Structures are given as C-alpha cells and as structure tokens.
Subunit: 293 residues, 4 copies
C-alpha cells in the first residue's frame, strides 16, 4: 500500500493536521506558562499526540517528486535524509521517559512546538487559495500575540514572588480589579484575569495602542516591551502588508474593471461621443468584460 | 405601469434610500443600546419605516436584466425567488406582533438592520463615482465606530449594576467627570456623557491612540478590546487602504503629468537642449497634455 | 509697464510671498487664540500687510495666458473678474476702520487666513521640484497641528472659567506642572506652558500616540478628539501617502537601478556567464546606466 | 604595495569597519550622556581607535576610478582633496590635548561620530545585498532610538538639579520603581534603570505607542516629544517604507509566481480545458518557472 501525495485523502489529511498544529500552538505554550504546579483536555491532548504519530507512518507511505517516486525504499530514505529527525523529536513522549522535578517534565513538552515545521513544509498546499492564506495570516498574528502573552506572564510570575516591593505588572493587576495579593504573595487574580490581561497587553503592544492601565515598570518588562516594539514593527508591517496585498489580489478584478471603465468613460468625454453610440461602447465593455474577465 | 432601472427617477430613489439606510444604521443601534428600559424623531422613524415599505412596491414594478425583462409576472417571480424574504423581514412592524415585556419589542427592532443589504445589492450604482466611494468609506468607518460604541455601552451597562465593586468603565467615567453614582448604583453620568465617551473610546481604539483616561478593566471589556484591535487592524488595512487608493486614483491626472514632465525634463538635461528649441518641447507637452488629459 | 509672469523677478516674488503666507498661517491663529485682550511682532505685522497690498499692484501689472496676454486693460479685467475679490477682502485694515470692541476686532483679523488661497493659485510654480513639495507637505502637517492647537486652547479656555469643578484640560495642566489655578481663576500655567502643551497634544493626536498626561475629559474635548481622529486618518491616507510617493520619486532612479541590476544579475547566474565575459556585461550595465539614467 | 578596491581583503575590511562604526554609534553617545563624572572597556575603545587610524593608511594605498588609477601619488592627492579632512578629524586623539575638566573632554569625543560618514560613502558596497540592507535598516532604527535615548536623558539630567520641584521624568521614574530621590539628590534609580527607561520611551515614541507610565511634563521634554513625533513620522515611514519594499523585493519571485499562476488558472477555467490537457498546461508552467525564475 502507498498514498499519492495529490490524492483527495492526502489533501484532507494535510488540512486536518493544520488544525492539530494550531491546537499545539495554542495549548502547549499555555500549559507551559499558566498551568505548571481523565480530564477532557488530557484525553484530547493524547488523541492529538497519537495523530501526530500516525502522520509519521503516513510519511513512510507517501509518494514524492523527482515526476512521482513510488518505491518504499526510496520513500523511507527520502524521509530519513530530511524531516524524520524533527518529526520524531516532535513526538518522543519525554513525560513517559524522565523523572528532575515535575516542573522540568512539564516544561520539556514545549518540544511539541517543532510541529509548526509541518506547516512550514506544506506551504505548497496551503498558500494555493487566497481565502486560506488570509486565515493563515490572521492565525499567525493571533498566535504571535498568544505566545507573547505566555512569555509576558512568565516574566511577571518570575518577578511577582521576588523582593519586588509591589512594582511588577501582576501586583498592579491585583490592585486594579480589587483582588490584591496577601502579604505572603498568595491569593490575588484568577488564571482567567491573568491570561486575559496578558493577551490584552500583547495585542495592545503589537497593534501599538496603550490604554494606560497595563504598563511595564521593571527592567525585564521594559526590555520585553522594547523587543515587542521591534517584533511588532517588523511582523505587523510584513503581515498587514501581505493581508493588504491579498485583499488587493481578491479585489483585483474590480480594481482592473474601474481602471478600464475610467479609460472608456474618459475616451467618451474627450471625443464627446453621441448618445446612440455612447450606450453601445459602454454596453460592449460590460459584455466583453463579463465574458473574458 | 413599470419603472426602468436606469431612469432618472430610479437613480434618485436609490440615492434617497441610501440616506434612509444611513439613518437606520445610526438610530436603530442607538435606540437598542442607550434608550431601552410623539417626539420629532419618533414621527420621522415611522415615516422612514413607511418609505422602506414603498421601496418594496417599487421593487415589484422595476425592470431587470438576466437584455431587459419588463413583464410584471417575470419581475415578481425574480423578486420572490430573490431578495423579497429579506426585504419583508426588514419591514415587519414587530410593535403589532408582540405583547412579553416592552424590552423584547424594543430589542427585536434590530431586525431593521437588514436594510444594510439594500446598499450591498446596489454597488453598481453606489460605487460608480470616486467622490461617492470616499463618502461611503468614511461613513462605513464612522458607522463601525458607532456600532462598536453601542456594544461597548451594552458591555458597561450590563456590569455597572452588578456586584462590581466599582471597577467597570462607567464607574470610572462617573469619578472622572465629578458625577459619581449613589450607593444604589443610581444617578451618575448623563446619556450624552455616556454616548460621547463610548464613541470617543471606539474611535480611540480603531485609530490605535489611547489617551489613558478611558481604559478596559473587566474581562469582558478586555475581550471586547482584543476584538476591536483585530477588527481595527483588518478594517484600517482595508478601508484606509482603499481611501488612499481612491485619493491616488483621482490624483492619476497629476501623477502622470509630473512623471511625464520629469521624463521630458531629464531628456532635455541629458541632450542639453538649447533654449530656442527647449521651450517648443515643454510648450508642446503642456498643449498635448491639456488637450488629451 | 508690465511684468512677465515667467521672469526671475516674478519667480523670486512668488517664493517670497510663500514665506509671508507661512508667517500669516502661524501668527494670525496664535494671536487670535492665545493673546486676546513698537514691539517686533507689532511692526513686522505691518511690514507684511504692506507686502500683501504691494502684491495686489503686481497682479494688476502681470501677464497671463488664455501665448501671453499683455494689455493692461485685459490684465485688470481678468483680475477683477477672477481672484481680486478674495485678495481685497484679505487686505482690509480693520484695526483702522472699527472702534465694536477689541475682542471682536482681534477675532475679525482672522480674515487674513484668506491669504492661504495665494498658495492654492500657484501650485504650478510651487510643485515643480520634489524637494519643494516635501517642504509644502511638512509645513502643511505642522500648520494643521498648529491650527488644531489654537482650536484646542480655545475649547479649553472657553470652559476653564465655567462652573467646571476642575475637569477641563487647563486645570489638569496646572496640577501636573506645579502651577495650580486658584478658585478665583488666578495664577495657573504661563502662555508658554499652555501653548507648548496644546501643540504637544495635537501632534500626539495626529500621529496617534497618547502618553497619558493630557487627555480629553469634557464633552467638547471628546468631540474635538473625535474630529482630530477623523482628520488625522484622512491626512495620513493623503499627506504621508504623498511623502511616501515623493521620497520614492527622489529614490526612483536608484530603485530602477537595483531592479534592473537584479535582472542583469539573475540572467548572468542563469546562463553561468564565465568571468572574462561577465565583467564586460555588468560593467557595461553600470556605464550605460550612469551615462543615461 | 597597493590594495585593489574590489579585492576580497578590502571587502572583508569594509565589513569589519561597518561593525566598528556600529560600536562607535552605540558607545560614544552612551559614554557622553550616562558615564560623565586600564578598564575592561577602555582597552576595547583604544583598540577600535587604533583600527580607525589604520583605515586612513589603507585609504592612502587603495585604488580609485574616474578604469582604475594605481599610482600612489594620484591616490594620495585624490584622498587629500576628498574625504581626508573628515577622516582625520574623526581620529584626532582628544584624550591627550586638554587639562578643561573631564566634563569637556567626554563631550568633545562626540566628534568620533564623524565615522558614520565612512558608512555614508560606501553604500555602493553595503546596499548590494537585500539581506544586508535589512540589517542596515533595523540598525538605523535601533541607533536612532538610542541617540534619542541619550538626548532624552541629557534633557532629564540637566533639568533634575534645577528648581524642577519633582515634575521631570527622572523624579517620576524614582517614584514608579520605589527608588525615590533623597533631598540631597543622592541615590535614586541606577544607570540601568535610567538607560532602560530612556530607551523604552524613545522606541515607544518612534513606534507611536504610549503605555502611560513615562510621559513628558516639562516644556523641554514636550518640545523633545514634538521633535520625536516629526522625526518619527518621517523616519518610520521612510525606514519601514524601505523595509516593506525590500521584503517585497525578496518575495518578488513568489509574488510574480502567484500573479502568473492565477492568470493561467483563470485562463484554464475560462476555456474549460479538459483534464488531460490541463495537467500538461500547469505542469509545463511549473517546469518553466522552476527553470527560468
């Protein structure tokens, strides 16, 4: 048995694995930042790990181009000469292999972020349709915002229990919603209050608006904000440059239409064309356009 | 009788209905957000509901293309298999169909917003002129800012009477203008203070400038601000992408004129054309340009 | 006698009147907003008014085109039927003709802002050079910020002495700089403190950055800020759209040079041109480019 | 001996002198602003001054063009009549020449910033590669943000020992991090706290976001922010205008590929091409594109 890389199954499988990479890009950074000390998420997370292992076996049973190559020896060698290393490191369950506290074991599952490479390889499939690349550009923006929300909470939570004298962003969140910390550094805002504030501040930093209630005070928070002003000015110019270019690509029929309509309209004015002829020129352009695009 | 879809009457009637759709887009969300619990505005609201019913009668009596079709049976069946459902739901007077508190009758009149579809149906008329497209783009921006101001006041007003402990944006507005709420959660800012502050905050969010006085504190206000930063970055890349394109399209006389005058001037400097001949080249280009555009 | 409109005198005079229009555009709005009830700014204002009256005599003695028309009667009729009405209204010496209080007379001298039309008439001269239209664009941006600073000070100063309860931007300025207003309306910030703050707030609003210290609190300050958010967005779609285009126009020879160099370079790589030949191709491109642009 | 200006030694030397000009552009403004009244950095600072003197001797032995000129006497007089004056003043040992405080000597050594002219000359080398001009454009942005951070600290530090009355940005910093300034002016924020806050405020100002904690209060701070809103809106639009153009230039093969692929895709749909012929058309287009770029 072997799967053809252009078959309708392999198309549906690559679009299914895109959604499981988006699940990984959301819930791995979130669990590593907010949750370090069956449940519905624990069974879903195991299902997703099993499907990323099935995808390794499919990559030993799929054709490739040099026209098609269809022999299991030449297929398995092509995978071992390239991506099989990264696809295996993205799948080794170190949680079942290491014991050294459970903080390290829970953090080590960040190795799953190598699954983003399965989206970097397959841009030949995903970038073919203009409506699908708008979804990838908005998910790239919302995932850059989410990963920065996890780094920003890690930076805050590694300074909140310090000899901080109540200066870092989490102590100010405690005051601002009426949920102050105890003198022990314990209690205070919930995980929803802290995550929603960390995502709000990083969309605020990336889209360059500051409403004044969350702001960086410590040197680590200021250095993070300088880095997010550099990331924001590159990535927002590149992403919304590409979103504008793809919107201009989708609008390009109407953009060419109004341009050629203005040529015909201005030619009619310049020659002062009589009405019985004028209607025939304008109706002809509407016919020749709606026939040929 | 029958109306031609290209007649000067049907042109004026479509440009009149645009102003009644802009009236609907302003005053229906405003009434549903700020006024729920005759005036000159109430008799005008009835007159506008009557004119949107008269427009259904005109749609049963207009010719259409699928060359023109003029037979009333083929007109009626095309409308009934087309927009008549949406046009009728936009015209139902729910005041006469429901009797069970008054708040349901007030809120259900948001079904009038289906009248926005009467603009999207007719972009062939409405988008023909660059001077009309600039008006529609700046009204679409100012209407998105207004609809978000109605949603932002609903989010504030659905938390202000709660067990809030004075954290939401309406309590802060009361303090910031010297109009605080009494212990019952009553009194506070006026409807003018609350509307002008909501509209100020959503233009502030959409144009990405935060002056620091209005800011989102509760998780619903932060999640709304995350949504307005996503909407605002797509909308500002699309609307102000198109507004600058329409400005540069209307500038396409001057842009070609400067570029061609520079090509001629650099040709003159490269060949070092003597003054007796040079003026003939530049005066010819001014004549040929002002003749041909 | 008569002056030829292309002569070096008339060229130097038109570029001198641009500087006197820029003087008018700065110092008339400033005096009419900040300084309502010899010194250098009293005597220079008379010297400038005389030069704007001398310019009316030059317009009665200059050639025009409808080749040139040079007859003094056909010049005088062409000006009397054209711009002379506006140039006369922009010259009436109300200081010497009204006695009716000074608070009206100082405001009535804002009629001098009709001198801005003497620039709109002459864009054929002033737009000829790419470096001169960059100067007009940066002076237009700085003048829009200055005129808005005068409107923002008028809005602040027309509410500060009201039953305000210390809410308008001028009371907050007094508190922030350690120069508080007394309850009598006495003391408070100096005219430099009030002007530099109003110019800062309107560059802040137009470039969409809010540092959090000046913010609009009263309903008129919020309605002003909504107008500046609508102005600043149309202006960035237009002024900084044009500054981008003019900077790319100054860079256009170099932008074409790199584009054509990469086409030569990729042709050389695709054919793998040997070194003895390759230099003769890529040095010939540099010779042909530097010789001809 | 003489060095050929195109040789692989002289290429590596000009890229090494770029990195030493970046060292000068960082550490000269910083030392003149923050460090005013051998050491591990003073040895590096001397080594770099030696290499900027060695570069003058290399320029007395480098060939030049008007085909190449090889003769040392024609080389020397061309350098003496050209850049030698600026290159020499950029290398005078001002450590040795004054006895007149260290406060003058540290200010005087800002003349080393004339080494930026060595990069302004050689843009024929440095701009050749698109990935090198991306590195230059992000270094120009980070260096403008750093030079402004040094001017902003010079403003705050010159006003702080005046009759400031706790209004200027450094007294606010002292309070906001819990390191308040003592009545004798001793202690307060460290040089890391003051520099990281100064750099944070200038990236904040240039990228037009204000998080509300650092803000300009005094008139000189506000006039500086007006200048950074002018410099920011010109430089950010020109730098990220050029980064946008360079990212589009590097992507241009793929942008052309999508444009031409969608012409072929629309042509195939318009003519309704059968599958046996369709595959031959689009497989030919991919074979052709991957061969010719």
């Amino acid at each position: 048995w072997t799967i053809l890389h252009y078959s309708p199954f392999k198309a549906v499988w690559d679009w299914l694995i895109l959604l499981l990479v988006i699940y990984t890009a959301v819930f791995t950074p979130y669990s590593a930042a907010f949750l370090l000390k069956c449940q519905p998420l624990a069974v879903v997370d195991l299902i997703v790990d099993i499907m990323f292992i099935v995808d390794i076996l499919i990559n030993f049973r799929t054709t490739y181009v040099n026209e098609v190559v269809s022999h299991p020896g030449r297929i398995a060698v092509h995978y071992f000469k390239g991506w099989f290393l990264i696809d295996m490191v993205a799948a080794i369950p170190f949680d079942l292999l290491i014991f050294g506290s459970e903080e390290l074991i829970g953090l080590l599952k960040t190795a799953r972020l190598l699954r983003l490479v399965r989206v970097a390889r397959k841009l030949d499939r995903y970038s073919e349709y203009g409506a699908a690349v708008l979804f990838l550009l908005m998910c790239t923006f919302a995932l850059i915002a989410h990963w920065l929300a996890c780094i920003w909470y890690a930076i805050g939570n590694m300074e909140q229990p310090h000899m901080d004298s109540r200066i870092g962003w989490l102590h100010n969140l405690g005051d601002q919603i009426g949920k102050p910390y105890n003198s022990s550094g314990l209690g205070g805002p919930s995980i929803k209050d802290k995550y929603v504030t960390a995502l709000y501040f990083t969309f605020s930093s990336l889209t360059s608006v500051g409403f004044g209630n969350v702001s960086p005070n410590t040197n680590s928070e200021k250095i993070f904000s300088i880095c997010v002003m550099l990331i924001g000015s590159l990535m927002y110019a590149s992403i919304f440059g590409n979103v504008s270019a793809i919107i201009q690509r989708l609008y390009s029929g109407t953009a060419r239409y109004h341009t050629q309509m203005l040529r015909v309209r201005e030619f009619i004015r310049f020659h002062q064309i009589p009405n019985p002829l004028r209607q025939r020129l304008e109706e002809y352009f509407q016919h020749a356009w709606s026939y040929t695009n």
